[PDB]
Each structure stands twice: as structure tokens, then as C-alpha cells.
Design a binder for this molecule. Sequence first.
Ligand SMILES: OC[C@H]1O[C@@H](c2nnc(-c3cccc4ccccc34)[nH]2)[C@H](O)[C@@H](O)[C@@H]1O
Ligand SMILES: OC[C@H]1O[C@@H](c2nnc(-c3cccc4ccccc34)[nH]2)[C@H](O)[C@@H](O)[C@@H]1O
Ligand SMILES: O=c1[nH]cnc2c1ncn2[C@@H]1O[C@H](COP(=O)(O)O)[C@@H](O)[C@H]1O
Ligand SMILES: O=c1[nH]cnc2c1ncn2[C@@H]1O[C@H](COP(=O)(O)O)[C@@H](O)[C@H]1O
Ligand SMILES: *Cc1c(COP(=O)(O)O)cnc(C)c1O
Ligand SMILES: *Cc1c(COP(=O)(O)O)cnc(C)c1O
Lengths: 810, 810
Amino acid sequence: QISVRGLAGVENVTELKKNFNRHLHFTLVKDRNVATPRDYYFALAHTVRDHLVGRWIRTQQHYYEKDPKRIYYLSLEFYMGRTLQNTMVNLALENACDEATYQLGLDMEELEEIEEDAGLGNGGLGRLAACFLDSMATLGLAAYGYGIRYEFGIFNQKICGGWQMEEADDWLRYGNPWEKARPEFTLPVHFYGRVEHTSQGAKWVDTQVVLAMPYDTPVPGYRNNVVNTMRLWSAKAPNDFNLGYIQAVLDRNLAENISRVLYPNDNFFEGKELRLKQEYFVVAATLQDIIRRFKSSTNFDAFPDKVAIQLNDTHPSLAIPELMRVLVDLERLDWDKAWEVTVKTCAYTNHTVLPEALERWPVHLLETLLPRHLQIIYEINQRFLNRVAAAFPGDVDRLRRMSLVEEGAVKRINMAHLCIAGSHAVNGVARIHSEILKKTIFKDFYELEPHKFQNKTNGITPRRWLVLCNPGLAEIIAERIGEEYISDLDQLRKLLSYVDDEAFIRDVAKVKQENKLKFAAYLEREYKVHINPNSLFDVQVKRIHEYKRQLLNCLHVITLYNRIKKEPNKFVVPRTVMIGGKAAPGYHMAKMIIKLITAIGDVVNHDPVVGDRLRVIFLENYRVSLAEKVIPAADLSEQISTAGTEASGTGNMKFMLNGALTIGTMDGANVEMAEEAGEENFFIFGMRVEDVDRLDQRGYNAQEYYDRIPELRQIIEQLSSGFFSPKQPDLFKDIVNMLMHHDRFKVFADYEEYVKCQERVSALYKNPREWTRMVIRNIATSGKFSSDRTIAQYAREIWGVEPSRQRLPA
Amino acid sequence: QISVRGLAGVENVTELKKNFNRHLHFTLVKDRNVATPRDYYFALAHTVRDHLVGRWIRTQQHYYEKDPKRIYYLSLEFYMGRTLQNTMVNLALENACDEATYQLGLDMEELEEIEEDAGLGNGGLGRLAACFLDSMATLGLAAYGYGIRYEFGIFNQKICGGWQMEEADDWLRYGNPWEKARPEFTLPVHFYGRVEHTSQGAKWVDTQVVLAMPYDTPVPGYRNNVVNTMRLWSAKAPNDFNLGYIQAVLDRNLAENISRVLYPNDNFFEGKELRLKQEYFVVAATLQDIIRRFKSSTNFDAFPDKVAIQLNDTHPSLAIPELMRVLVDLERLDWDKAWEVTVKTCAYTNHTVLPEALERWPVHLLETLLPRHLQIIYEINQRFLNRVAAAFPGDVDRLRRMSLVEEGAVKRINMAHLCIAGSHAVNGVARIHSEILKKTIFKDFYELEPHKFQNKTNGITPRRWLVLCNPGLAEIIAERIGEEYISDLDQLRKLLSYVDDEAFIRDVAKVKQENKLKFAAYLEREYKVHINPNSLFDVQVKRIHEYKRQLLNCLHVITLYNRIKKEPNKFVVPRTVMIGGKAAPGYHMAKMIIKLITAIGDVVNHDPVVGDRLRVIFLENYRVSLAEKVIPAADLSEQISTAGTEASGTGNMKFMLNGALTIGTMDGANVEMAEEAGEENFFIFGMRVEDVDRLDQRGYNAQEYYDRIPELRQIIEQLSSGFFSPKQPDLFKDIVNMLMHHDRFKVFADYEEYVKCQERVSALYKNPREWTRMVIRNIATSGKFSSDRTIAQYAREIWGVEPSRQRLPA
Ligand SMILES: OC[C@H]1O[C@@H](c2nnc(-c3cccc4ccccc34)[nH]2)[C@H](O)[C@@H](O)[C@@H]1O
Ligand SMILES: OC[C@H]1O[C@@H](c2nnc(-c3cccc4ccccc34)[nH]2)[C@H](O)[C@@H](O)[C@@H]1O
Ligand SMILES: O=c1[nH]cnc2c1ncn2[C@@H]1O[C@H](COP(=O)(O)O)[C@@H](O)[C@H]1O
Ligand SMILES: O=c1[nH]cnc2c1ncn2[C@@H]1O[C@H](COP(=O)(O)O)[C@@H](O)[C@H]1O
Ligand SMILES: *Cc1c(COP(=O)(O)O)cnc(C)c1O
Ligand SMILES: *Cc1c(COP(=O)(O)O)cnc(C)c1O
């Protein structure tokens, strides 16, 4: 079919066919006469899995013999999505399998659609972890992902009457062929109890035990025969647990609840006990595993030469005092030596700046749950503050600002402070974010230890986010510059020499149009909704939060609507405006925003005077598999967070790679993206960070904008008076109230510039040749945003290991 | 090695070896350098499972094409034990696998010991269901076992300080290679709600839904290529269940608790709501499955020609009103037609006579949980009592005696009464039990409908209970009369012509001695306990209950002890007395009996004057896999229930088949066993049923026996005064009090005859040649007690289908 999908050699195809039939018969216990498409999917998945395992066993064997430094990536989230196609791509099996299935009378694309997303994350942070695992394997690093195997991942979103409803994501219902249970490597985790001081140091006693059972999933690198491991822990009760009889057995559920469900909140901290248990559970089990593997190569001086532990935000921050606990209490190292080892082993990545996102755990929770860890934390704090006092003598306010312990009605532990003190490296996730960290929020820490602070700008894997989801674009690129760019994305820069090539312009535009038709058809089939596929596809997909300003997009949409109603017989560039994303279940304002988006659509989409010129669509249940469909179909990428709020973004990079132009603020990685493509090839608008600060100094008054902008005033009057909610006229009064009086993200302040910038987008879209030339300039400069680049930087500058592009033997 | 284990042909051995290595590598994801014995067990189990599936698919295919009448065996318990060896035996693979494993450097016996018992039953009733499935497959019947897949089966028993402790039996921890999840065939079950009457009949509405997910296990027949199915339901919550968010997801456990744990009570009724839910759950899911299979061959007149439903006691009795509900409410048949179909479809097996074992559910429970079923039950009752009134006019007391509804403080439904009314056949499980049913407890029902009442004496499968557990005995038998007896156990009668053959006498005695050495070694290894293997092995293994009279055995043991202490230098036949069995967790007296047994052992086993002449051993954690070891090692089988209390017994039959002599009362199947072997070849003692009745008429006074028997008086004084409990002198006062004042099972009344009969056993054991000749006479007449015989009788006399010994093609 296409070149970038590998060879379909006669013998490979024959062997895949016979193994497919072997798994259908023996593994699934089905004959051909009763097998459903789901059975056929599983037969294929098992067939493809068999090609992994030889490489998996060999890879892990090689690491045991060579004993390289090991990288442990600790995260509460891994948003993996589907595995079947990714595995085929990485093993060069895609064309052989397509042919093998074709010859059995099956359509492989249809079978790929049956696979559940592994939805073990909320959004950007969890998906970054997934991209990183892919890049680590592709770069030959001896890396392990460690997390929790949630029984229920991110909820499935249904819209009922324009409102979000949540349904449990029962992703394991039909089984997971990709994982292997390893109950033989089960480990104990302790909770509660009390601390006893003896002659022989501290002892943690009278604890409740929960077992941690590992499940291993293979992580294949791109065509290098390397298969790394993601190890996810599941919670099990011990068999003497509570041991009338019947009730004791049913109460085992209380222990197993720890790994039941992913907390569905992106960028907001909720201090629940169950969440703290999850955090300790993953840390405690993972560290025992790390230490046993280190001992099976008494001396912990070499520990940091053999182990790096990367903390994906503060969620696994308890790794720091847990490592200290093990080294001091169990291994009997003195404090100072243990601390040296811990700091050199641990590194911390920060992913936010909103004060409500920082983890600050009440002391009373830690006191009850993890009394030994609280003691270690106080000791860490005391020694740390002795260092601050010696460096800045007399600076008493600095001491309370830098403390790990926050004073107040409730005493709290600031986990970010703990991470900085206990790590040899601290990094933000985009250059502007890393600067903000050292200038404002961790300024005091930066002055004490400037050498700790780094930047590692985020990236995305070009395997999933180009080759897999946009094979048409990958192919036309491969026709011109070959295949090496897939594991060296900087080679896309060669495409600048095709910017005036008429054939390439035609092909880039044709691929986009095919992707748009394919997506428009998908909308009709699965959701009974029609769209004009010649319209500009204006897409904002990401989790729903105020700082992302889905509401600013809504204001633009209503502006275009009002303009059309005012001058119906004037030409305007047709648009399909698509907004998608999940709201956290407890977040009232985010749920109201979803309702507003669907309410706008109810008016706009049924106005006969609008025609097919404007459509507003809420994309239901946005998730990794839906991103793989909509991103290649997009013309315009909306990246419109208030400057200083989006730490990086990664969706922005996915769109850039797939031939959409970007409208956005100078926020997060948008700054670096514009810098790479040239500002003239980007639709930049709005306040910069400095402009936001100036506004905050004199005070943001929304009323001033309302008074000066007639078009904005009209929209606020329509919202208030019930134009978009005739049966419930006051339905949106909280939104209006927030915008006029309590808007932290300054929606009105960027309105005017956003609308003007949107007119420039429309003007360019009228000239397809120039639109497409600007697209080529974006794709061609997207190379920096490969996660291979990000990971190579972590490896050299933080972990002290060298990446490799060498094949292991097959 | 031995003939009855099949051929080890060169090509079979080679293919097993290559498949073993394929499963180790691909299925388990292990190399040889890190594999443990457990891994090797799983590799073997998967290798053997592959040979099942072709036959399994073919068998189910054949039934779909031929459309024979289908037999559905409904039970809350299936006590399957281990599967690996049984599967090898039934497929003629045992020698090929032994050789294949031997050539890979592995001992297959060692790998067999790693397998968990599937302990989904309490004792005799659950194990009968398992034997029956084996016989049904061996006789070529299109039969399905339907039950519940409990997450936790019968508890593991630990003895701590002589007391029973219970531990959860986490039998699925490492996976079950024998089952196949079928989530595609998941079905809804309804609970709670209310009934609405319309023009179009009754509607059950506002119900809570629990999903029933089936797991299928293969059941191979003996060398006939037939593989039937056991389908076990597991409980799952629907995904909209309760749908703050987090709590709704955690509350899914409430629905899934239905299939969490087996109720661990043998022969005692506890009316718990969770138990009633389990009973309806299995019935509701099973009936939908039955009906869909019937529709996929509008007319229910043929239903009883295509379906038989056998009820294993009253536990699935709700099948009767559920079948009526479906036919009347959903299919819209008139009542009388639906009733005709139901009665002709259903049959009921009774397994007890103790009034406290009968299921009598409070009306308020049924009213809340299953309101439509309660309505149907009242309607059934009304119509049934109209028939009684017409047959016996004026007999007002008969009407209240036969009612399905019992009056009292709490109104109750008598489920046995429902079963009799709603079934075309009612059977007991041994001739004396079936007679008792028609003379006393169901006398009124027998007078109304004598044609319903039958006997089907229980049996045991000779595959598990001879070939598998006692290969040495199977072989010496096969040397003389061939192999056909394994599926036609009446052929053992040919062994009577060897009763005077010196070589056969020698070989029978040698096999027993080997089994005893093998068991004595097993005791030393796994439990650090030494036993004289030349002693008589006196074994009582069964669940602990007062009616089984483990206490009568205890009194004998203390009598022998006191006799030795009185005349130390006199010869007595050495004995190892072994008592084993689990007590129901809430049953105080049964737990006290276990403690008494261990306390006796603490005195007897450490008395230097006793020497190796007497040992008392409590066999911990008695279960199916332990029965397979101890039963072939036994010399004397203790079957000493009070006459009229053991409905049948099946342990008794296992011992008979394996070369133990029986000491017992004329109770249950013991009567038929003595009748088959001749009373002169059996150690019968004690009151018959008639003698018990005579005692009850004039009143049982235990004090009379105490006053007349000095030896008995001495034992009661030792118990009371703290001889067996020096640190707690009054520890056994409840046992003494019960024996003297409140003994329903008349332990003292059989004491004298039991002790005299035990002296006759000892006298015979002194003459090994005559002991062994009596053994040959027992084994030779054990043919009636094959479950193949039992099942053939069910098939012809109840189900109306003909058994077959024909092979399906391989
Ligand atoms: O670096 C990858 C992404 O991490 C996101 C994030 N930042 N914090 C979280 C987050 C995820 C899950 C649970 C949380 C709980 C509390 C606070 C933040 C989070 N997610 C940032 O908002 C993005 O700008 C960034 O591109
Ligand atoms: O026919 C097979 C066996 O069934 C046993 C039984 N009889 N009732 C139960 C029973 C099992 C499980 C749960 C129960 C709950 C209440 C009452 C009885 C039971 N088990 C009888 O006691 C045995 O004599 C008989 O050999
Ligand atoms: O003692 C050993 N001998 C040989 N190989 C080992 C040993 N321990 C670990 N390994 C290798 O390391 C892998 C197990 O990885 P683990 O998760 O670090 O235990 C296996 O696939 C083995 O190849
Ligand atoms: O529609 C059908 N066509 C062919 N075979 C069928 C069909 N339905 C059921 N079967 C057979 O019956 C078996 C399924 O059993 P079930 O549990 O009764 O559904 C399969 O193994 C098939 O061979
Ligand atoms: C990339 C991705 C995100 C992150 O998008 P942002 O626009 O950076 O928030 C969230 N969810 C899914 C499913 C993704 O694929
Ligand atoms: C056969 C068997 C029973 C039944 O024995 P009885 O002596 O008839 O009560 C109970 N438990 C197990 C494990 C068995 O194998």
C-alpha cells in the first residue's frame, strides 16, 4: 500500500495467517462461524504480541548482563491510548498484517477501532509520560515506567441535553492482551501504625499491610528491537486480612480500592486521603523493586551511578522521604550519607504555576497515615533551613517562605518545596515556564541553589503523532526526503526547499482534504451530524478549564454569528468550529462552559440564514484515539490560554506536525514554536506575560471593555437575557457574573485583538496556495518538538547517560 | 511406567515438549534461567489445555447440529479440586506428559502439587456435583453445569493452639488456566423494584440491575472425546451504576459482592440476604441462557422435550417461580400451560432431613428483594392447596402442613414444599433416606402424588477416586481383569474369583503399605509429625458436625488410652487415629470438638508409656486434594453418624473403593454398601433408625449410661476435671453438658457397642491374610457406587435421555 508501513513478504504473511488462526482456535476458543469482529481483533493482537516477547526477554536479558545505569520514571498517570497499531508500526509489521488480514477476508482498520484506549491519565501530563516511554525505548535507554494500574481510567463523557454525564471507563472488561500479571513479584506496602524509638534507631510498627501486585506492559522502540517495561501496581489484600467471617472477606475491598480509580482532575489539587494512599502505594512498591534490582547486579555509594529516579511533578514526591526511610531505618546508613545518595538519585519536573494546583498536604493526614515519613520531613526541613539561615543570615521572612512546613489554621507540607530540597535537578517544561519558576514562584530556591534549575521543553512522539495518525502526510514527506526523519525529526527542515514546488503544495493540500473528508464521514456515522468539508476546520481540543479560555473562543463564535445576522448577504469564509474536552466532575464552571458551547450550537446550527457558513460542534468524549482522528483534519489550532498559565502545552505541537496553522498567545511552548517557524508564519495575538502583570498592578476592570466595545456588549446582553437559553433565561448568569467581576484569566482583555487576528486567518484561507505554503513552513520547523530531542536532553543533562540509535539483534 | 496411564509414543512426546517450550516463552514470558516450578506447572497446564479445545469446540458443535435434549444441572457448589491430572487421565495423556517432562529434567508429580484446589463447595453436596459432571461427559449426555464463580471458595483452615483459624482461599491469585471468560455473553439480573399491573398483565419495574458474566470450564469425559461445559457466573456492576463521582465508582463493589464468597456452612440454614441474592443471581442468569439456546434450534410445548433442569437441593429453587415469571410475564403464556411446562422441566433432589437444614425464607425478605416472585409463589400455593382440599376434603390440618407459606411470628416460605409442587420428580440420595422422605418428612406430599417420589443412590467417579489417586491399586486390578472396569465399575465383581489367590492377596496388601509409607512421609515433610506406618490407620475425614459424631470417636480414643495406662505391659494392636475436617465459622460446638481432638493428642502423643502404640492426629485443612492422599492410605473408614441423620455419605464409598474396611452404623448409603459386600464383611454396630425412634418415645436419658458404664464415667470425669486441659480446667464444660443433658445424636447410647465392635476390628487386623481377603470382598462389590450408575438412572428415569459409551471423532 504505502512505503512507510514496511514490507509484505510472502513468508511473513503466511506465518501471520497461520498464527492468527492458531490464536482464534486455541487462545480464544472460537470457530470461524461464530467469531465476531472483537474476536478477530483479539486474535490479531495476540499474533502481534508474540513478536514482542522474544525482543522483550532479550532486551531485559541484555540489561542484566551489561548493567547500564537504570532510569525510573515515576508517574501517577500514563495515557497510553491504543497499542495495536503502534506496536505494528514500531516492529515494521503494518503492511504484512494488513495483507495477512486482507487475505483472510478482514479489514484491519475496522479491527483497530475495536481496541479500548488505555485511559490511565487526564490529559497532557499523562500523555507526556507515554510519549517519553516511546522515546526512551527508541533511544536505547534502560528505562522503566512505574505507575498504578487503575481498574477505571479517565471517565467516558456523554452529553445529555447539553450537559456532561460521567460513565465509568471499564477498560479491562474484555481483557488486556498487552499486559502480563507478575503475582510472583508481589510486595508489601505499609500504612498507619506508629513510630517506636529503640537503641537501634526508629522502627515503624503496628502497620496495616496492602499488597502491590505488578503488571508488566511492553514498550517497543522504533525499529531497534528494544522493548522496555512499564510496570503498573495493583492493590490486593493479604489473606489473613481482618482474620464475622463473611464480612471480613467482603472488607478486603477497602484495601483494593487504592488502585480502583484515577482521580479525574487536571490542574487542580484536591487533598483526599485516598489520593495520598495512591501516591504512597506507587512510591513504596516501586522503591523496593528498584533496590532489589540494584542489589542483584552492601554499598550505596554507587546507588546514584546505577539509578536515576525522575519525579513527574510532586505526585510521587514521597519517594524522597521513603528513600531516606529505607536507607536510614532499614539499611542503617547515617543521615548525611543517605541524603547525599537521595539528592543525587532524584530529579523533579514541575508542570504548573497555578497556586491551586500545588500539592499541600495537611500535617494531620500525614501524621495518621505515614507517621515515620512526617518525622523524616521535619528533619529534612530543619537541616534545609539551617542552610538557608547560614547563606542569608537575618533574613527571617525568607525562612518562612522557603519552609517545607506551611503555617496557618491547618499546618501543611508543601511538596514542591520538598522536591526542590531533595533533588539535584529541577526543570520546567518550556523555556518561558522554566524562567517563570526562577523569577517568581521558586525565586528563593533559585538564589540558594541556581545550579539545580533547568529547562527541558516538552515534545511529542512522531511515531504516534505523524506516522500512525497521518500516514498520507508521512508518505508524501518520505517520497521527497526518505524515512530517516521518523527517528530524527530535525530532517523535516529539508522540506523548506519544497516551499515553491507546485507538486508538493498540491500533495500537502490533498492530504489535508482527504483527512477532512475522512473525519466528516466519521462524524456522520458515529454521531449523526453533518459538516461542510470545504469549510475551515477551527479546532480547540483540550481539558475544559478557565485558563484555557474556551470562553474566549465562544465569544468569537457569537461575534461571527451576530455579524452574519447583521449582513446576511455578505461573503464570509465558511467555518466548522469544533470544541472538545472533559471537565473535572466537581468543577461547576467547567460544566457550565460545556453547556454554553452546546447552547450556542443549538442556535447557530439551526438558523437558516447562517446556512452551511458556520457550524459549532461539541466533540464528545475527547481522548487519545479521538485526537488521532481530529488533529490530522484540522486547519486552525486554537492555543489561547492567558499568557503565563499554560506551562507548555503539547496539543499545540501535534497540530503543528499535522499541517494546521496556529492561533495563539505567547504562552508555554507557543513561544518556541513561533520562534522556530518565524512569527510571520504564526497567528500571534494578545497580552504577553509582562502585559498581564501591568494589568494586575493597576487592577483588571472588565467593565471598561464592556463599555468600550459595542460588539462585546451585545454578546453579554444576549447571554444575560436568555437569547441562548429561552426556557431558562438566567441559565448563564454565573458565567456573565464571572466575566464581569471575578475573571482571573482576563477574557475581555484579549477579545479585540483575538477577533482581529481571526480576520487575518480568514483572509489567508481565501488564498489556498499561500495558506499551504505557510503550512509547509510550520511542518518543516516542527523538528524541535520531538520527544526524542526532549529525552536526549534529560539523558545528557540530568540522568548522565548517553542515548543510542543502535539495533539490538532480532 | 504403568499400563492404565496410556502410551508414550515418540511423536506425541516430541510435540508436547515443543508446545511446553512455546507456552513457557510466549504465554508466560519467561526464559529457562528464571523459571520457577510454578511457571513449569503453568506451561504444562496450557500444553494440556490445548488438547481439550479442539474436542470442546467439536462437542459443542455436534450438540448444535443434532439438537439432543439438554440437561442443566443447577448447583450453588461445584467442588472440582485440581484439574491437571484428571484432564491427562481422561485424554490418555498421562504417560506421554510424564515422559515429556522427564526429558526436560522435570518431575511431573512435583508440578501437580503446585495446582490450587478449585474449592467451590463445602463437602459432599459440592463434590457430588463434580463427580456427576464427570459421569455425564463420560456417558455422552449433552449436559451443562451452572453455578457461581466465587472469588473466594471454602476457607483454608489453620490450627493455632489447637483452635481453627480461617483464612481466605484466594484461589485465583495466580490465574486459572482452565477457564475462559465469555464477557460477550453477559446478561442482566434484576433485584428490588415493585410490581405494576396493566391491561397487558404484570410488569416488574424500578429494579436494580447486576450483570452476570459467564466463565466456561471444560469437562472431559473418559476417553470418548466428549468435552462438556461448566458455566459459572460472576457479578459485575453496569457502567452507569450510581451515575460524588469517586464514591459512585467505589460503590460498584456492592453489586460485585454477590459472587465474592462461598457461604461456608454444610448442613445448616442461615437466612442471610446476601445468600438469597446468590440464589436468585445463578437462577436468573442460567434461565435466560437456557431459553436463548432453546430459541436458537415461538412454541414452548416442546420445551420439556428439549430441556431438563435438575435442582441440587432447594438452593436454586427460585428456578420454579422464575420460569413461571418468564413464561407468563414476558412470553405471555397462560398460567396453566406455563405450569405444565415448568413441572415437566424441573426435578428436585433432596439431600437432608435435619429440620435446621431446610431453607425457609422470611416473607419480608422476598417481598423487598423479589416482589414479583413472591406473588407467583402465593398463586402457586393457592392452586396447590385447592388440589389438596379436593383430594382430602375436610382435612384442615393437612392444608396447613402442606402449605408453601408457614405461619408464625415471622411468615416464611418453605422452599422444599415449593420444589415438590413444581417438579415432576423428587428424589433422595440413598434408599433409606428416600424411604424416610416418604414415611416422615414429606409423607403428606407422597400421599397426594406418590408417582413423584424416587431414589437415586449416590456415587463417586472411579476416574478421580481410583485411577487418579490410587494408580498402584488400579494397575494390579488391570493386570487381572483389564481396563474396561474404569467406565464400567460392575466388572470389579470379577475380583471375587481372586479372593483365594496368594499373589493377588500379596499385591493388594503391598499397594496399601506403599500408600501408607507415602502418606507417612507426606506428614513428616509438610507438617513435622512422625507416625508408625505399621499401625492400623483409623481415619475419620468429613466436615465437623454433631450428627457425624466425631465425639463418639474421641470417646473410643480415650478408652484405648485409659486401657493402656491401666495395663501398660499388655499387647494391643497399634493405631494411628486421624480425624480431619472443617467447622463452619459460626458453629461454636464444632470448634470446641476440634479443640478437644487436638487436646487429646497433646496428652496421648507425649505419654512415654503409650509409646508408638497410639497416636491421635488432627489432619489440618481437609479438602479434595488431601482426600486423594489420605483415602488410599486408610485401613479403617469411620462412618458413625446416628442412624437417620446422614442422607447418604460419599466419603464412605471412596474408602470402600480404595481398600479400607468400614466401621459404621446402618445409616445412609452404609446400608447399601453392607448389602453389596455382605454384612459379614462390614463392621456394623449401633442403633438402627427404629431403635432411635423407640428411644425418643420414652426419652433419652444420658445419665443412665453414665451410671451403668464405669469406663464411660471415667472419661466424663477426666473431661470435667481438666485432665485434658490443665491450665483451663473447665475448658470442655459445654461438651460435657451437651453430652449429659442436651445430646440430640445419642453419643452415649452407641458407646458400648462401638467399643466392642472396635475390638473385633483389632482382632482381624492381627491376621493380615484375613484382613486382606475381607478387603478384596469390599473392593470387588463397590461397583454399584460408581456415579456412572447413578447418572444412568437419572437419565432414564428422570430426564428421559439414553446414555452412550460411543466416541466422538478426534
Ligand atoms: O508538561 C505536560 C503538561 O502538564 C500539564 C499539567 N500540569 N499539572 C497537571 C496535572 C495533571 C494531573 C493531576 C494534577 C493534579 C494537581 C495539579 C496538576 C495536575 N497537568 C500542564 O498544564 C501543561 O501545560 C503541560 O503541557
Ligand atoms: O448427597 C450428597 C451429600 O449431601 C450432604 C448435604 N446435605 N445438605 C448439604 C448442604 C450443603 C451446602 C449448603 C447447605 C445449606 C443448608 C443445608 C444443607 C446444605 N449437604 C449430605 O449431608 C450427605 O449425606 C450427602 O452424601
Ligand atoms: O539470577 C539471574 N540469572 C539470570 N538472569 C537473571 C537473573 N535475575 C534476573 N535476570 C534477568 O533479568 C530479567 C528479570 O528482570 P527483573 O524485573 O529485573 O527481575 C530476566 O528476563 C532475566 O533474563
Ligand atoms: O448460528 C450459529 N451457526 C453455527 N454454529 C452455532 C450457531 N450458534 C451456535 N453455534 C454452535 O454452538 C456453540 C455455541 O454454544 P452456545 O453456548 O449454545 O452459544 C458454538 O461452538 C457453535 O459451534
Ligand atoms: C495531547 C493531548 C492533551 C494535551 O493537550 P493540551 O492542548 O496541551 O492541553 C490532552 N488530552 C489528550 C487526549 C491529548 O492527546
Ligand atoms: C467426599 C468428600 C466429602 C464428603 O464426605 P462424607 O464423609 O460423605 O461427609 C467431604 N469433603 C471432601 C473434601 C470430600 O472429598
